[PDB]
């Protein structure tokens, strides 16, 4: 994938509609169904403390950046077979770009 910068404002509405039920982004926000996403960028998958990941997510051992995140959110199970993240995917390029723009800033 090729991340282009988008609207953080729409990315927040995208996050809050499609991600917030399973995730938080603030520093020190609680783990829910999924882990807190603070400092997700520049961190390998499966390394947030306090959350029990799938083996699949740990062994993927992917250093998250803008681009591989875009691929992941298109179809999570396809990028990480075995993941227990039950999310179909953000199919539209512009929605993924909008969200990741928000996510960069919101996870500090
Ligand atoms: C539950 C109904 C979820 C929804 C909706 C979304 N996510 Fe999720 N996510 C969820 C789980 C249970 C997990 C753990 C996966 C595992 O196999 O252990 C995840 C994982 C992620 C990750 C990876 C984080 C890591 O530390 O490796 C990311 C980046 C992530 N989720 C982001 C994310 C976004 C952006 C969502 C909506 C757009 C979203 N998730 C929805 C559970 C659920």
The C-alpha atoms of residue 29 and residue 20 are separated, in whole angstroms, by 11
CA-closest residue to ligand 1 atom 25: 45
**Do 85 and 56 form a contact (C-beta atoms < 8 A)?**
no
Q: Measure Cα distances from 10 to 30, 31, 57, 58 in Å.
A: 23, 24, 28, 30
| Binding-site annotation, residues for heme c | 19, 22-23, 85
Resolution in A: 2.7
Pocket test for ligand 1, best of 87, 90, 92, 107 (most atoms within 8 A of CB): 87
63, β-bridge pairs: 44
Interval between CA 40 and ligand 1 midpoint (Å):
11
**Do 76 and 22 form a contact (C-beta atoms < 8 A)?**
no
The C-alpha atoms of residue 104 and residue 10 are separated, in whole angstroms, by 14
Elucidation method: X-ray
Pocket test for ligand 1, best of 23, 68, 106 (most atoms within 8 A of CB): 23
């Amino acid at each position: 994938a090729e991340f282009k910068a988008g609207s953080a404002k729409k990315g927040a509405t995208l996050f809050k509609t499609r991600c917030l039920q399973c995730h938080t982004v603030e520093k020190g926000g609680p783990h829910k169904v999924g882990p807190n996403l603070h400092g997700i960028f520049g961190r390998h998958s499966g390394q947030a403390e306090g959350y029990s990941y799938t083996d699949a997510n740990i062994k993927k051992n992917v250093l998250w950046d803008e681009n591989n995140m875009s691929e992941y959110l298109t179809n999570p199970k396809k990028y990480i077979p075995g993941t227990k993240m039950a999310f179909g995917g953000l199919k539209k390029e512009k929605d993924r770009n909008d969200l990741i723009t928000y996510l960069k800033k919101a996870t500090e």
